[PDB]
Design a protein around this nucleic acid. Structure first.
Ligand SMILES: [Mg+2]
Ligand SMILES: [Mg+2]
Ligand SMILES: [Mg+2]
Ligand SMILES: [Mg+2]
Ligand SMILES: [Mg+2]
Ligand SMILES: [Mg+2]
Ligand SMILES: [Mg+2]
Ligand SMILES: [Mg+2]
Ligand SMILES: [Mg+2]
Ligand SMILES: [Mg+2]
Ligand SMILES: [Mg+2]
Ligand SMILES: [Mg+2]
Ligand SMILES: [Mg+2]
Ligand SMILES: [Mg+2]
Ligand SMILES: [Mg+2]
Ligand SMILES: [Mg+2]
Ligand SMILES: [Mg+2]
Ligand SMILES: [Mg+2]
Ligand SMILES: [Mg+2]
Ligand SMILES: [Mg+2]
Lengths: 271, 66, 103, 88, 70, 117
RNA sequence: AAAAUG
RNA sequence: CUUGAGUCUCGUAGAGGGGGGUAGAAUUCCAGGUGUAGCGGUGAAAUGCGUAGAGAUCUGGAGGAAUACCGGUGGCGAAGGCGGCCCCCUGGACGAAGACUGACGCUCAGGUGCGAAAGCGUGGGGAGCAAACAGGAUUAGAUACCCUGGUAGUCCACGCCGUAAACGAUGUCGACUUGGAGGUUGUGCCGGCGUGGCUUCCGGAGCUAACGCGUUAAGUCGACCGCCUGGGGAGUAC
C-alpha cells in the first residue's frame, strides 16, 4: 500500500511510504547472509571515484539465487522478505530436498506458492526456463545475458522484459529501457514481472531520508568557483557555458556508448 | 421475400452449416440485408452471429480480397 | 456441469499428432467426470483466408459436457500448444449428440 | 441469481412447506442469500454500477419486508434476524 | 468486386460487370462516407431524417392516390 | 530488358490525380505515368481525360517489356477509375481481370474533421 | 474565389 | 380477505453491466525489393514531401485505436448511455400455467448513489484525430473559415470534477376515455383466429393562445414531490 504521512512536522508533510504487510517481520535467514561494508564511493586508491556516496544504514547482504539452476525440484515460498540491498523484495523458498534459497520476488508471489525451474517447468510466474522454452510474447524478468551466467536484466522493482521474437539461436527482447536486444535463446528468464511495482511511488520527504540511504548531497557546478568545475564562477548567478560534467564533457545529449564488441546484439537503441 | 428459417423451424442457424450461410453473403463476403433476402429479424441476428463465428474459424471469408 | 462446443484447428504438418491430441483431450474431460457427446475429425480443409501463412488446417469438433475448470485448463493447453493455430470454445444450452453439416 | 437447488433449500428451511415460497421469512432469506453471495462479486467488480443497482434493490426490499414482519409479529422478526444473522 | 474476364466475353461487357459489382458492393459510397468524420449526433440526425422523409414520401404517395388533378 | 507478357496495372485514382503503375505479377514496377505528369496541372489534372492520357503514356513506358496481358487493380474514388481501363484495353493489352482494391476499414482510424466551406 | 457598411 | 405489491416454478429476446481473451479490415511507422520524376493539396495556390530516390507497387515486421457488412423511427438500460467474436461473473424485463405471502403500497424535503463531453491528479500508453501553436493562403485586415504540419487531449488504471439544448425543453405512481396502419418480442388454438410486453406513425372526442397533444395525453381524475411570479441588473455580488 502507498501511505501518505500526516503533516505533524514539516519533515513529515510530504513523506509517502510504501508499506507491505506481507513482508516478514523477523530476522533474515542467517545461512544466506554475508557482511557488506560500505565504500564511501572510494576505490582501492582511496580516492572518490563516484561522488555522493557515504553514510547511511548498515546493511547485510542476502545471497540471492539469480541462476535458478536447481532444476526439476519443486520449491515452496516460505515467506517474502525485505532486502536492503535492492528495490525488489525477495522470497525465501524451500526446495523439496530441504535446501533453502532466496529469489527475487515476482509480482503475485506469496507464501505457499510453488515454483520450479528447468526446461519442463510449467509456464507460471516465478518459474525459470531457458527462453527457447518460453512462448514468444511472454513477460519475464531476471533474464540471463549468457547461458548459465545468472540473471542480469530486469531485476529492479516492477521491471520486466518482453520476448518479442525468436529466430534460430537468439531471441529478441524488449528491455525496460526500450532497447531491443538479442540474447542467446538458451539464456534463462523467470516468468512474470519483478514485484514491488509501487516502489517508485514513494516520496522521501526530507533530506535525512536520502542520507539514510547513503546518498550524500549534490553540489551544483554553477555554485562553485572556476578552479573547481567548468560551471564555476561569476559575480552573482552566471552561466554562459554549454553544460558539462565536472570533467568537461557535454552532459545534455552527447552520447557516450562506445562498445563495438556488443554492437551486434543491439537490434534497436532505446530511443 | 418470405423467410426460409421460419418456414423450416430452425432453432439455431448453425455457423457450421456453411452451405446455408453462403446464400446470405455477397460475392464480396458481406452479410446481405434482411430486406433483400426476406429473413425475419430474429433469424437475421442469429445469422449474423453465425456468419461472424464462421469467419473467425476461417470457414468463410471476411472479404473477397484476403 | 456445462455443455461446450469446441472446434480446434491444427497445423496441417502436425496432422498425425491429432489422434493423440483427441485422445488426451477426451481423457482429461472424462477424467473430470466429463462426457463426450459429439466428436468429429473433419480433417484437413482449405482455409477461407491464410493463418500464420498457412492455407490449410486440420479441424476437430468436440461437443463435451464438463466443469468450467477443466475447460479453462483445455484452453490454456490450446494457447501453449504451437500445433493448434486457432480454437473456439462456446457454451451450448443442451448436449448436442448429432451429426454436423461437415459429416 | 440463486440456483434452483439453493432456492429450494432456502424455501424448505424457512417456509412451512416446499410450496410456501411467499412467506416473509422465505423472501427475506432468499434476498439475504443473494446479497451475501454478491458481496464477493462486487468485491471483485467494484465498477459494476448497473448490477449494484439490482443489489441495492434487494437490500431495500429486504428492509421493507423486515419492517413489515416487525410490525406484524415481533417474535417471528427476532427469530428471523437471529437465524439470518442480521443486525436489524 | 473481383471480375475475371470470361472466354469470348468482350471488354465492354467485363467492364459493365465490374461496374455493377462495385455498385453492389457500394465501395464508392463507403469511400465518400469515410472521407471526413461525422459526429455521432450528426449521424443519428441524418439517419432519423432519412427515415422520416421516406415515411412522409410514402404518405404523400398513398394520399395522392385519392387526389384527382383534373 | 527482360520480357514479361503478364503484367498488373495499378490505378491509384484519387480525387486530385491518377497514378498508373504497371508491375509484373510479383509487384515489381516496370513503368508508371500520372495525370499530373502528362501535361495536366490543376483543374485539368483531376479529369477522366488526363487519366486516359496517363494510362496511354504508361503503356508506352513499358512497351519494351513485351507485356501482353494485364490484370487491372483499381484503387480509389477519383475520376480516372474507368477511363484508364478503357485506355489500357485500347492500347492492345488483353485485360484478363478487373479488381477493385479500394481499402475499406472495418471501422478503424478516425477520419479528419469535416471541411466548412 | 472574395463580397463590409447604411 | 386478495384484487395492489411481492416470492417460487419453466422458458424467451436483448449493443444492460463488470472482467479476461481473441479475429479480420485499415491508417501510421520501420526494414528491404522494383522503379523514376514527380507527389500532395486548393475555388486557384502556396507552404510541405521528392533525384540523399518520393509518390506508386510488392514482401516482412512493430504498435495503438476502432469494430465495415449485419443495422433497422431495431434492441437493452433509471438516466447518463451501450455495437466484431469467445469465455467468466452479474443486473433487469417479459410470457404461460399454477402455487405461495396477505396491503407488505405510492410519493418523497433533507440524505445518499449514479451521472455525456471537456477538464484535474498520479502512473502508463499514444496509430489515427486534434484545442494550443507554426507556416501557407484568402482578405482592406483575417489573431478565422481553407491548406500543410502539430502538442495537450482523445486510450488504460485509479481517484477527482458533478456540469450539458443531461430534451419528449413534457416529475413519479394509479385509474378511466372512439379508431387506423406498422415495428419488435412472448404465448393459446387451429395460413387464419386470439391474447400479453415494449415501440413508430397518423388521427377522433376533448384539451390548447395557437402550434399542437391525442389510450406511450398536453383528455378525464386521484396521491406525493420539484419549480414559476415583467424585462434587464443576475444565476451575478457577498
Ligand atoms: Mg550523483
Ligand atoms: Mg538532486
Ligand atoms: Mg561562491
Ligand atoms: Mg576551468
Ligand atoms: Mg548578474
Ligand atoms: Mg550572462
Ligand atoms: Mg429476483
Ligand atoms: Mg484534407
Ligand atoms: Mg428545499
Ligand atoms: Mg473524459
Ligand atoms: Mg489525464
Ligand atoms: Mg496520463
Ligand atoms: Mg488544421
Ligand atoms: Mg443545469
Ligand atoms: Mg441526451
Ligand atoms: Mg423529457
Ligand atoms: Mg430541463
Ligand atoms: Mg421515486
Ligand atoms: Mg397525433
Ligand atoms: Mg455562481
Amino acid at each position: 500500500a502507498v501511505v501518505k504521512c500526516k503533516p505533524t512536522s514539516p519533515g513529515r508533510r510530504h513523506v509517502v511510504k510504501v508499506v507491505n504487510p506481507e513482508l516478514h517481520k523477523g530476522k533474515p535467514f542467517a545461512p544466506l547472509l554475508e557482511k557488506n561494508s560500505k565504500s564511501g564511493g572510494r576505490n582501492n586508491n582511496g580516492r572518490i571515484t563516484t561522488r555522493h556516496i557515504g553514510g547511511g544504514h548498515k546493511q547485510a547482504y542476502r545471497i540471492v539465487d539469480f541462476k535458478r539452476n536447481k532444476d526439476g525440484i519443486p520449491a515452496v515460498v516460505e515467506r517474502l522478505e525485505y532486502d536492503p540491498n535492492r528495490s525488489a523484495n525477495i522470497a525465501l523458498v524451500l526446495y523439496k530436498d530441504g535446501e533453502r534459497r532466496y529469489i527475487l520476488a515476482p509480482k503475485g508471489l506469496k507464501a505457499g506458492d510453488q515454483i520450479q525451474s528447468g526446461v519442463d517447468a510449467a509456464i507460471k510466474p516465478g518459474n525459470t526456463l531457458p527462453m527457447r522454452n518460453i512462448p514468444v510474447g511472454s513477460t519475464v524478468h531476471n533474464v540471463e545475458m549468457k547461458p548459465g551466467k545468472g540473471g542480469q536484466l530486469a531485476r529492479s522493482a516492477g521491471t520486466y522484459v518482453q520476448i518479442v521474437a525468436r529466430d534460430g539461436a537468439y531471441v529478441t527482447l524488449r528491455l525496460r529501457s526500450g532497447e531491443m536486444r538479442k540474447v542467446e535463446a538458451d539464456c534463462r528468464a523467470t516468468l512474470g514481472e519483478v514485484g514491488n511495482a509501487e516502489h517508485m511511488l514513494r516520496v522521501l520527504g526530507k533530506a535525512g531520508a536520502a542520507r539514510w540511504r547513503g546518498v550524500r548531497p549534490t553540489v551544483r557546478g554553477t555554485a562553485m568557483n572556476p578552479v573547481d568545475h567548468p560551471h564555476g564562477g561569476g559575480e552573482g548567478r552566471n552561466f554562459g557555458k554549454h553544460p558539462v560534467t565536472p570533467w568537461g564533457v557535454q552532459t545534455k545529449g552527447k552520447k557516450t556508448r562506445s562498445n563495438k564488441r556488443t554492437d551486434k546484439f543491439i537490434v534497436r537503441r532505446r530511443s | 421475400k418470405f423467410c426460409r428459417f421460419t418456414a423450416e423451424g430452425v432453432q439455431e442457424i448453425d455457423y457450421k452449416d456453411i452451405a446455408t450461410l453462403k446464400n446470405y453473403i455477397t460475392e464480396s463476403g458481406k452479410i446481405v440485408p434482411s430486406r433483400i433476402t426476406g429473413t425475419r429479424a430474429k433469424y437475421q441476428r442469429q445469422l449474423a452471429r453465425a456468419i461472424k463465428r464462421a469467419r473467425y474459424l476461417s470457414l468463410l471469408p471476411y472479404t473477397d480480397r484476403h | 456441469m456445462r455443455h461446450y462446443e469446441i472446434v480446434f484447428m491444427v497445423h496441417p504438418d502436425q496432422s498425425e499428432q491429432v489422434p493423440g491430441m483427441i485422445e488426451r483431450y477426451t481423457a482429461a474431460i472424462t477424467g473430470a467426470e466429463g462426457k463426450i457427446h459429439r466428436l468429429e475429425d473433419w480433417g484437413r480443409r482449405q482455409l477461407a483466408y491464410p493463418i500464420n501463412k498457412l492455407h490449410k488446417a486440420h479441424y476437430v469438433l468436440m461437443n463435451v459436457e464438463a466443469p468450467q475448470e477443466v475447460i479453462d485448463e483445455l484452453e490454456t493447453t490450446f494457447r501453449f500448444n504451437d500445433a493448434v493455430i486457432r480454437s473456439m470454445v462456446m457454451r451450448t444450452k443442451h448436449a448436442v449428440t448429432e451429426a454436423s453439416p461437415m459429416v | 441469481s440463486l440456483s434452483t437447488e439453493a432456492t429450494a433449500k432456502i424455501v424448505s428451511e424457512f417456509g412451512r412447506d416446499a410450496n410456501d415460497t411467499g412467506s416473509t421469512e422465505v423472501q427475506v432469506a432468499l434476498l439475504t442469500a443473494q446479497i451475501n453471495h454478491l458481496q464477493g462479486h462486487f468485491a471483485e467488480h467494484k465498477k459494476d454500477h448497473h448490477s449494484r443497482r439490482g443489489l441495492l434493490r434487494m437490500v431495500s426490499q429486504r428492509r421493507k419486508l423486515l419492517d413489515y414482519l416487525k410490525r406484524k409479529d415481533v417474535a417471528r422478526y427476532t427469530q428471523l434476524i437471529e437465524r439470518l444473522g442480521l443486525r436489524r | 468486386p473481383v471480375i475475371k474476364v470470361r472466354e469470348n466475353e468482350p471488354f465492354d461487357v467485363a467492364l459493365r460487370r465490374f461496374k455493377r459489382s462495385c455498385e453492389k458492393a457500394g465501395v464508392l459510397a463507403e469511400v465518400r462516407r469515410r472521407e471526413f468524420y461525422e459526429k455521432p449526433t450528426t449521424e443519428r440526425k441524418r439517419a432519423k431524417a432519412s427515415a422520416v422523409k421516406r415515411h412522409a414520401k410514402k404518405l404523400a404517395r398513398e394520399n395522392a392516390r385519392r387526389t384527382r388533378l383534373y | 530488358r527482360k520480357q514479361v507478357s503478364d503484367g498488373v496495372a495499378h490505378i491509384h485514382a484519387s480525387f486530385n490525380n491518377t497514378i498508373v503503375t504497371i508491375t509484373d505479377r510479383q509487384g515489381n514496377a516496370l513503368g508508371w505515368a500520372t495525370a499530373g505528369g502528362s501535361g495536366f496541372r490543376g483543374s485539368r489534372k483531376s479529369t477522366p481525360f488526363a487519366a486516359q492520357v496517363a494510362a496511354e503514356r504508361c503503356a508506352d513506358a513499358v512497351k519494351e517489356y513485351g507485356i501482353k496481358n494485364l490484370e487491372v487493380m483499381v484503387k480509389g474514388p477519383g475520376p480516372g477509375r474507368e477511363s484508364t481501363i478503357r485506355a489500357l484495353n485500347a492500347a492492345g493489352f488483353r485485360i484478363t481481370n478487373i479488381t477493385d482494391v479500394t481499402p475499406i476499414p472495418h471501422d478503424g482510424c478516425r477520419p479528419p474533421k469535416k471541411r466548412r466551406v
